[model samples]
Target: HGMAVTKVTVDGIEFPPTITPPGSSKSLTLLGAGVRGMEIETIQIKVTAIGVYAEPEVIASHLQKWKGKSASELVEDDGFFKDLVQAPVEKLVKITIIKGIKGSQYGGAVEESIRDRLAALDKYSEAEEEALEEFREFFQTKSLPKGSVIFFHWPSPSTLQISVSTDGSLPEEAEATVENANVAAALLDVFLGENSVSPSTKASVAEGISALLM
Candidate 1:
């Protein structure tokens, strides 16, 4: 008789994967729904953790699509942020500025808000000054096109992704738009670009973030 593969379950969920050499990325698929009704029934995924197995074919293709795309490319594309922002979990807010919005005019607020959840993340309060500076720079350079409802999804305790869309509406002559826009801009100013990290200090800053997160 042939040998049957060993099976293990954590909390009644099966881990779907084929074991490979050490350090090989593994794929995992979860077949259940969360309490909030989020379902990723057939998503392809890869994890660096041991005891994980991934379908080689799916992950190979998934990675191939990004062969020519750099991190900088992905950062510039708001659509990536949009998709992340659409995640059912995580909190977000939309602020509209009627006037005094730096980048563009035509402002309005859209629902499905984010309530300054930074403090909620255990990592935020203790984050290093350099890390906060990096985040601050990112926010500072952010300029969403007018009349857009962008998604800002929290990927992890330390990272946020954003998406922009101009299809939502706020009231006309609305002071809320102006107020919200300023708020959004102010927040953006706090974290948007790489200005906080100098070329000489980037390596150490990056290492610090990694160590802090770990």
Candidate 2:
């Protein structure tokens, strides 16, 4: 674990509510004050570390509605936490990571992990493979330094735009459109699903999201 989260911002606005989960230095938390019709347009999590992640997990979730519900209640209730992988993603946004990665091989490792996960879900297709390849290339070519920030933005239900930046600098972003909705959603499973990479990471992400969504 290299980076420690210093703050998390939504749509360039930083919220005062921030927490660090136990047993993790690379993790940070920000819970949204779930207001009715509160739509999140962008999330930028700022961290303290600079190294690359070895087994980093990137995942997302969309909840139809988040109001007057606790995160625990949301998951316990079968109807609330809709599985983005099997169903459509309509609202709410979340992302998760497992550990710090080394920059040298981070791209290849993520590409392979995504490929395997998608294949297992029977969701990886030729088009997806091409998209993933491009994703790998982006990381391979970009500069992911310590103290960098990652942004997951949703312009619409069918689009997920990802970006990486450092200290208030401009970001390098990429888009995963409707053509790879499954692929995009599957990333969340890498941490939230039972077969996820790390239960700790999954739990951390879930709790973080719950604090905000609930």
Candidate 3:
């Protein structure tokens, strides 16, 4: 049998629907969804908690094609995540939420929180620094609407791909690669470790990620 899997949904959105439970070998994989009738789209994060890591895979569906494929099948497909990572875009706000936004204030809030979290990780280099700056600029220029979900795919330590959706309008998928393979492990510390985001957000994500391990 494959890994024991569970369906995780916050409001009405579900994650990793195609792959069964514990579909990946990574230490933690999680899917977070917005509440019903909310504006935020769903988000999924997969992490390698230790050792040299392989590139994570992200697949998005605009036509609902990913709901019944095996993880290996996804890797072999010529899809967005694969193409985007291969083509490597400096940055793209693939999706945006326009409802209930008040200027750039909301984006700024997320930027500040991420900045602090990244800094707390204490593992930034010239390349990671540049990526963070680009992320900061994007956040400053755009305002995040209420209940918005943003997905970031770091094809590698130097390349970043971003997709966004509001209230589950469109689905975007992604993969992440880190310079120090350990960066993925470190991300766990910042995202799932101590002093992370609000307990509510972190707890929800943690619960989903932890379920796979159990």
Candidate 4:
């Protein structure tokens, strides 16, 4: 049930507008896509291109409260994204590498990010710590080339299925399934938060969500 990409370019990278995972019967629309880059002394370098996806039916059926809201309005309301993050449906976030790096570095960075965010919410606990260890372990032993892909598949609202891919193959199985709701929610916050790394993606996603309502 998988083949991919008929392009939407965001920060020089192309992401498929819709993707049907290897076994899923329905497709998830690319709500938005953008690059994560850092600027050092005026030199900006992209690290990754992130793409977020979700089912159209779910968007229409459940998000009626935000109806008629403009993209700018949606973009400003982190609460809308909070709703999207925990919505009970299939969603996927693709983080494709734009530069070469060790997975350990990435994993550690994410573990800290997720940990700190959860802590701020008073949601961090022993269970989340264990889930994060597995999250880190999945990438700690691998290396990520410039073209490597990391897929965070939320097969359900609370379950996160993570995978790494290269050679353009969409593998059917997940490399890790992180089972903590606190952990899963925090990661989504990293990507969809108000001060998100990818402003363009949040804007694009706002437009997409607004499209359904307006």
Candidate 5:
């Protein structure tokens, strides 16, 4: 698609092979990409195209301990992803919409998801609540159409920065910062945990990381 090494296509959507977060010299590789499909038995709706990216060297260094494991093995292993989440590596997640939708709806889901994880981990303090309110306030803009992209930058576990690009990808400004370690970990868990929301992305990432690390 756009000149990089190679693009990974999922459900007619293209994901770039690598990306660098705003204000950081470090570049992260795309470990996987897939659709966040809204499904029922009858009709399926492609809600968003999500790509998981992380520092290649950082992930490999943290994951090298599991060098002999297969993707099949790693995907099922709780320790692998938990270890990855705990590592102080930079990671980015890009969510692109196939159809137009309200940015507030997207914001609600993230705000809701992060809280549950934090609640489960007992990190839902007054400060965490305040941070999420700030995070949600940044997304109350107009409808985000087909070409919109949302970026989540986790430079470390304690900080998360989010940005939006309605023109498909040029936003580097960190619009909002959620300064909570468990909040970032919780968000990462939503994508890579055992009960991961994006199953396809998790699967794809498992294989990609297993191969890359080993």
Candidate 6:
């Protein structure tokens, strides 16, 4: 069951690759100007990422320097990628750089924070795997010929809308899965539960969607 809840509101929310001048602690240099400020005006904001993000295919093309090495190691060595990581383009905006987040984890922290923030806007169901597959299909498609609004068009109090709210749902729900049960039964279980899908099924669905995208 969904946990204790409260009202949900989104304000001045933004997502990944969109760089904003960190408030109080960081600055940006552009055209010899120091830009220092917070990007989002609202304090209690929720976000959903609505921009072009490279698929795993593109990421795979840019591989580790060593045959079995991790990308982080190479990134650490390269001054360019290091900077790129520090100052990512926001809204396709080529903002200049000043100081990055205070700590070494700034880049990853920013990326993950933005991702977590955005995911809150349009959450997956408890049936994590099943939901992920659908999400993957939603992402893989080149164009929405059908122009469907799975959530927006759905009736009030549907899983589509409820999952989008942070106070309404949580990461654990999106990461949930069916436990050793038959697939159809599990599906039925979540359908009855609402905004619930199994995590395992979601991954499986993602693979199928990725195949379709390829």
What TM-score would each prediction reach against the true structure?
Answer: 0.23, 0.52, 0.42, 0.93, 0.90, 0.17
Instruction: Name the top TM-score candidate.
Output: 4
Report, for every candidate in turn, its global Cα lDDT versus the true structure. Answer: 0.29, 0.44, 0.37, 0.85, 0.81, 0.25
Q: What TM-score does model 6 achieve against the real structure?
A: 0.17
Candidate 5 clashes between residue pairs 3 or more apart in a chain or in different chains: none
Which stretch of 10 consecutive residues in model 1 shows the poorest summed lDDT? 29-38
- Alpha-carbon error at 62 in model 1, in Å? 32
Tens digits of per-residue lDDT, candidate 6, 65-149, equal 2234333342233332322222212201111122222222322333233234334544423454454344333334322221111
RMSD in angstroms between candidate 5 and the native structure over all alpha carbons? 2.4
Write down the TM-score for model 1. Answer: 0.23
Better of 4 and 5 by TM-score: 4
Give me the runs in candidate 4 sitting further than 4 Å from their true place: 1-6
Clash pairs, candidate 3, are 5-21, 39-147, 39-167, 40-147, 58-174, 95-164
Clash count for each candidate, listed in order shown: 29, 13, 6, 0, 0, 17
RMSD of 2: 12.7
- lDDT of each residue in 1-214, candidate 3, tens digit only: 5999776543333443322212233321333222212223554322111111121233222213444544344433435232322322121221223245543554455445655655666755565555555555555554456545455444443444443445533343443223332333333333334453223333343332223223
lDDT of 5 by residue, 1-214 (tens): 6675765788878888888765678788998877787777877888788898988877888777889788899888888888877878888889897878787887787888888878887889988898888777878764678878988888788899888886657465777788877777788888888677788888788898889877
* Residue 14, model 4, lDDT: 81
RMSD per candidate (Å) reads 19.5, 12.7, 13.6, 3.2, 2.4, 21.4
lDDT string for model 1 (52-167, tens) is 11233443333343345444454454443333223223222233222223322211111101123233333233233334344334434445543334333232223444433355
What's the alpha carbon RMSD for model 3?
A: 13.6
In candidate 6, residue 135 scores what lDDT? 38
